[PDB]
Design a protein around this ligand. Structure first.
Ligand SMILES: [Mg+2]
Ligand SMILES: [Mg+2]
Ligand SMILES: [Mg+2]
Ligand SMILES: [Mg+2]
Ligand SMILES: [Mg+2]
Ligand SMILES: [Mg+2]
Ligand SMILES: [Mg+2]
Lengths: 301, 301, 301, 301, 301
């Protein structure tokens, strides 16, 4: 079966149509070729035969002087935007300005929503992790943080490509003149308006990129602080363990002393209890003094 | 209710007025449109119909040949600057130069104050943390450091956008000529003076950026030194624990020897005390020698 | 023996020939010199005497207006591409466009295959390592990750050089005109078509580079999370060891007490069992209380 | 009291004068204004009314066709350079070349001295720290390293601003022509000589920057090696502690066995010594075998 | 004594001479001044009075239309290159091309040799370190790695300066025309040949730089893997130590129980052996059960 395109068409007045059409018929209707309607690039804005071709991550659009076409809209939850919002926007400037503004605004709003969803989750996770009241931290939250960081990196890449394309178009004026397809087809400055639009969207994308970068550096700083806190807790607990081990060693030493003096043999000292009491007292007090002196020695270090 | 703008107006002589006006009335009074007085960008300097439009993080200003307007000044502690300092500054060069200089100086002073407040806190916190006399470090100070680093990153971003805008205006001369709205409205070089102003403020911002970068790298180096100190303390305490464990092991070994020789049974050796004394002496001295030899073995490693 | 080149030649119609020829004979047949057919650069696209010379990591090609030549194809598993696919591609545009498109498509497909092979292995390895259910991680998987990261870095370098060469050619128009060797030899716009080709391949390479960068940053984040998890497990186990050591210390203390009270001597207390039972009970309960109080003290920290 | 400038003046012949003068009198004597002699930038080279104004970190200079002036030289140990070296340098090229060369050479020599002082200290400290013969490292040396790294970062920033200013002047030719104040005031190529001077100093600064960067990367590598060494020592000592703990556990186990068999009760086995000797021998040998088997088990891991 | 230069001179035919000459005599023989033959820059290529002046790290060369001069060749093991290889290379293009090609080829070969020597040592050291079969790693190999990394950084810097100089010359055409000193002195395109030479050497240097960068990133990844392996071994050994400590604690607990029940007093239970056997059996089995239950509790965590 020959491949087909599921297209939805918007007119100047805002009227909407939807259908499916063969690629060859689409090429014949327009002045394009299969080389153009291939959509091999993640982000692209191009002009061919007075027709504008735009592609986002998943949005494919063709703009003509008298109509707009969205291709492959099925299974992408675009119905609300297509059948409820776009007609209002499209209903003195030409059609190209309105269409380009609508598409760019949609993409920018999508990116803003992504960032606004990502920010609070990361902030809450970092606030929970940095809490110095716990010697350990949860790991499910760490996995969540990793996934959200991956999503943030993808968002940063998308913003970067958006800005790159917009700036590449802005620098040259030939492309700016090309975007005015209506005047070329059927011959106030259009160039100024297009420059204003592109500059506005470029600045918005730059703001988003700065916010994402700030979030990433915050993540890194939080990771470093987490490392420091864990190391400090380790050192505290090891100090306590050493302090207890000193006492254990002293106790074992004097227990060996007592055991050796208390063998089941003859020592010529079983007829006196004063010696026994003296040994008990001296062993206990010496345990105490040795423990204290070892504590002081550790403190000296 | 229709939206309104809370505006304060400064004249050439420095006279001050304040009121609220509908956005449509503002647009009609000037030659602008709602597309311009939207304020969608964090930092922006633009020119439209011989009117300069400036926006900072929270400062919104419109400059005309004969007046200046500050918009949305309520609840921003700007009263001291507006009603005490600005009139003196505004009271032979045209009005645009004075207004632009005042606004840029205000923003630069704000950034300088932020940096001057941030620096000593971070320096004191790092000095306290780096102290090698403690095996552990406080965590409230770590949280303070994290918050101040976040603020520092935000300040760096603000300085970056400021410099970017200033340099973008400086490179082109068409924008420099545009800023001379008074001459265009009613036709010594203005371009040289504007270039001097913008270059001065750009250089000040560059100095601030360099200072912030130095502070950040200092923070990173301090973190690394903290890690090293904690690891060294860990190793010292573990060495001490191992040294004590050697003695504990030797003591336990010879205690087992004594216990085994001192069961409540018959060993055919309970009639002699010389053997008992010999066993006590040899067990103690051998404990000592084994402890010393294990210490030497550890030292060999 | 004089050096030779193992060449395979493709004609306009797609006919294929293969043989070996002396370098001097090759130079004489073309208008080149040994200075050109030296192949000292990993990636290179050049034009000499209306002949295009291209080199990839291991692919060496010479393009003329009427023929294409691939050099040193032996022992490189290029037979499938040479004798099965290329003739179909080469069978209204001139020959240079088809040849360049074929070579660039081959290289791009090779890079895409490399990346598609690398991605799932790294993802699976990282997913296995990040599993927080294990206090330790395997090391063979770490070695695999290291090798795959090295391969990824090599791939990134290759993509970078590809993009650099393509962009260097695109910026200038003299080189674009040079690539149209057929028109120069024997005098619709060729420049536009060549620009489209190069821009398409540059954009594809940029997408690949972005994907590789995302993978690398993911690797780094996974490493950090692994460090954090290991430290947390360390702290947990050390806390448990300390808790057990407290009880061991208390038990040893009261065992020393009992041993001291139970020497094989006279203590004037062997005629009463109530004292013995009291000592047993008090030593046990005090062991419990001291253990609990030390646990509470640790909890206070 | 009106502010004043402490100035020292050098003539063409090298004659020296020194005094203090009011800022207004200085402005009147020259053709400048207070806007110029403000010195708000850390590093600056500018030209105003055929007068060159230069500022370094602490050096302030004004160059005219017939004289040189150094401002605010008190309490900066500049007496040796001012009254011993500069007159010799200033005594066929015009005065501006000599003055600029002198100032730039002074600054470059200062930076070189800073770097030459910093290098050996850091190298010695790193050599001492990296010594793998110590399980721990000193902390005073770490503080010294931190301070020297801060100084190195400041030096890098200074070199960067120096290079930026020199290159900004070099790129344009209008500024190069401006620097030839003598010819403009009273109308072999001066531009070539100035370009040579600036290029020479730019190259020297670039060399210094490269050296500083190499030092910094060396510091980072040394830090990583220190971390690795500390971790290895930790692991070694923990392995030894585990080996000793195995023996302690076996000894305690068989000591419990002996104690249980040696209660102060009736066991119907006190009439035979062969059983006692057998128990002693078997407990000792089994202690040995269990210790060895646990050692082998650890080795298996 | 006046300073002198130890020079070796090559003619067009390849004839070689060597001697020492005063700097003033050298300046007089050529059309240069002491300002030129100062050699203050690590890497430099310049043209003065139809004479080319080149300096590498330690190679100093002056090229004229009719001769080449190498200065300060003593104690630099350059005899083999000077008296065995260079004459063959120098024996239709002018002399400047041959001389420049020879010098650049020498430098490139030197850099290639450095890199080829450095690579295998680092690879072997990293392969030895990454071996996961050892809980610890050697430190002499770490010192070797540090030294080789320092050398690699120096090599990268040298390659960078080489590329910077070559590209700076390539971008401008005035310098390219300047390098053709022979035509200027005594008036096929020379510019094309010089561009080809410089581009070839620039590309070779770029390849070397990419290789060095790959090596450095490999080093960093290996360091991270080493850290991970050490941490995993630490955790394993700590888990084993905890498992042994559980058993030690249980054994000590029940040993205290036995000791308390076995005091040298009256307990009204010395007339029955069944109680003694029951206590022994229950203490042993309970030791086992408590050890197993603590093991399960640890496993739960
Ligand atoms: Mg993506
Ligand atoms: Mg902000
Ligand atoms: Mg490679
Ligand atoms: Mg400074
Ligand atoms: Mg060097
Ligand atoms: Mg660590
Ligand atoms: Mg007894």
């Amino acid at each position: 079966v020959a491949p087909v395109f599921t297209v939805t068409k918007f007119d100047k007045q805002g009227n909407v149509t939807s259908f499916e059409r063969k690629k060859t018929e689409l090429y014949q209707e327009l002045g394009l070729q299969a080389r153009d309607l291939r959509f091999q690039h993640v982000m692209s804005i191009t002009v061919r035969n007075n027709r504008i071709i735009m592609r986002m991550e998943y949005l494919k659009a063709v703009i003509t002087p008298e109509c707009l076409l969205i291709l492959d809209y099925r299974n992408l939850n675009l119905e609300q935007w297509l059948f409820r919002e776009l007609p209002s926007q499209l209903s003195p400037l030409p059609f190209e300005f309105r269409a380009i503004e609508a598409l760019l605004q949609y993409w920018i709003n999508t990116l803003q929503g992504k960032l606004s969803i990502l920010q609070p989750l990361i902030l809450e996770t970092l606030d929970a992790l940095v809490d110095p009241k716990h010697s350990s931290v949860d790991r499910s939250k760490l996995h969540i943080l990793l996934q959200n960081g991956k999503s943030l990196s993808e968002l940063e890449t998308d913003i970067k490509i958006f800005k790159e394309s917009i700036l590449e178009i802005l620098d040259e004026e030939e492309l700016l003149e090309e975007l005015c397809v209506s005047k070329w087809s059927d011959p106030i400055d259009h160039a100024e308006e297009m420059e204003l639009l592109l500059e506005n969207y470029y600045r918005l994308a730059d703001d988003l990129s700065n916010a994402a970068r700030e979030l990433r550096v915050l993540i890194d700083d939080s990771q470093s602080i987490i490392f420091i806190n864990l190391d400090s807790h380790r050192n505290v607990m090891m100090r306590l363990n050493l302090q207890l081990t000193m006492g254990t060693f002293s106790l074992s030493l004097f227990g060996l002393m007592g055991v050796a003096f208390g063998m089941n043999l003859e020592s010529s000292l079983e007829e006196d209890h004063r010696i026994f009491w003296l040994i008990t007292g001296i062993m206990f007090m010496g345990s105490g003094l040795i423990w204290r002196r070892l504590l002081s020695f550790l403190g000296r270090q």
